[PDB]
Amino acid sequence: GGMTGVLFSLGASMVLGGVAQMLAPKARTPRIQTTDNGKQNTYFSSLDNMVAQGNVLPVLYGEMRVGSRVVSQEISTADEGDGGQVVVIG
Amino acid sequence: RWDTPKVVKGVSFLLRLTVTADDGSERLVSTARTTETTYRFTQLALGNY
């Protein structure tokens, strides 16, 4: 137990994947679909309304106009009324 | 013409017209699926419907 044989140095065994990978951990590209055609969406953009069923609530960090997750949509009859008494319908 | 009731998502209006026959039965004259609240019928004949 005094000695520690089999030092087993690791050099190119970790370089073999690439050198910038051992300084920066790289990024994950999304999966490409077919019905989506060629619109390569990323993981930090959403310009359409989503559905909030058993999903997570997204967060925003700066600028970059985004869509939303619809929680309630309803149509009723538009009653006549303003912020006052002027209610002419002639 | 009518009003829009309580609604989820979106709605369309389906309207059909029936004409009472001479013996007592019914005759269907056309049908329409629309989105506008107001509809107009033109060139109608016979009596009650």
Side-chain angles (χ1 to χ4, degrees):
Chain A
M3 88 294 275
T4 306
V6 196
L7 66 162
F8 233 137
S9 98
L10 68 185
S13 178
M14 81 175 48
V15 160
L16 184 139
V19 50
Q21 313 314 80
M22 76 179 38
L23 269 38
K26 209 56 183 302
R28 273 90 181 141
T29 164
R31 324 191 41 101
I32 298 85
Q33 293 84 320
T34 278
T35 74
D36 184 352
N37 244 335
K39 305 283 310 312
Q40 332 164 264
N41 77 84
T42 59
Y43 303 74
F44 43 95
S45 98
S46 298
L47 283 303
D48 67 27
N49 295 356
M50 315 214 89
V51 52
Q53 166 52 50
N55 290 323
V56 311
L57 189 148
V59 317
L60 189 41
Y61 278 125
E63 281 276 330
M64 84 160 306
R65 47 163 277 196
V66 292
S68 88
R69 306 191 152 263
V70 180
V71 53
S72 63
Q73 198 183 311
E74 181 186 289
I75 314 168
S76 147
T77 305
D79 80 42
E80 177 33 71
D82 69 0
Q85 294 88 6
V86 186
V87 291
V88 160
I89 327 101
Chain B
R1 49 159 94 91
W2 50 87
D3 42 73
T4 304
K6 183 68 40 183
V7 160
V8 188
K9 303 288 317 183
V11 303
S12 266
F13 300 102
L14 164 151
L15 60 154
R16 87 207 292 118
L17 197 54
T18 173
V19 178
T20 299
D22 310 71
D23 60 329
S25 165
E26 300 295 332
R27 297 297 184 267
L28 164 145
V29 47
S30 173
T31 200
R33 320 188 76 140
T34 178
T35 85
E36 197 143 341
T37 309
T38 304
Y39 199 84
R40 180 192 300 174
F41 291 100
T42 295
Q43 289 182 1
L44 275 290
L46 309 190
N48 38 13
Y49 57 72

